[PDB]
Amino acid sequence: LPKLWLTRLAGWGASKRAGWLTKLVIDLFVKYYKVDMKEAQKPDTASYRTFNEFFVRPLRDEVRPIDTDPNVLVMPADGVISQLGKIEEDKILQAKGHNYSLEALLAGNYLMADLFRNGTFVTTYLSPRDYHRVHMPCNGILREMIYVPGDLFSVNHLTAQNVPNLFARNERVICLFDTEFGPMAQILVGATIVGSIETVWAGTITPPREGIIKRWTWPAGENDGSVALLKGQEMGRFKLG
């Protein structure tokens, strides 16, 4: 199967308003994936005009309490830990017997990579089941965003264990922030079907897929037109297309 063509198709489908057929595909999805519509702001599977509207569904305000201890960096996405720990120089663990370059992940940006040499990484896996928006792990001033064209491999555990440099070659958006904990990078990596990435400050980054690397910068906190986000605040999301 051709992964891009399939993704473009699913995105056409996911964005069409088909009332009963949308509800059907949503309901099959909810059932097959064991989705917990309890936590949804609108639990009635009939409340969603398009499939994508459902995929990107909000949660009930109360159900994601943000630990308020200002020394605690909180989790940015629902799902499960893929891998985490020390960055062994430039080496990041993907799966058993599969490492990848920090520089590769950051699309050859040797300056950014240097900030994180021997630092800490967390790779969170969002399954179709899970809420598909991404929240800030701490307060931060947005400094840099880099869009990286790439492949649309699956990112499930099977694929992680078998495709080399998976996260360094799949289409992704790199967000760099200044924080009270020094520089912090939060990277949204797309997958097959679910290849559309947004940020709250820039809307939908992809599609379209123009095949080139784009970089945006913002000033330091103390300046006109700087962008600040708070621990636990929504910063971006994934949808189909």
Binding site: T120, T124, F181
Partner: protein
């Protein structure tokens, strides 16, 4: 989907409980300052 965090060296320690396949919910503790 996937989200990747990078933190600067000696700035945070990951909560020791967390390991591969640990469940994550937005706002639960990920790491603690040093």
């Amino acid at each position: 989907x996937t989200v990747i965090n990078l933190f600067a060296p000696g700035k945070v320690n990951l909560v020791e409980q967390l390991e591969s396949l640990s469940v994550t919910k937005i706002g639960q503790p990920l790491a603690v300052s040093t």
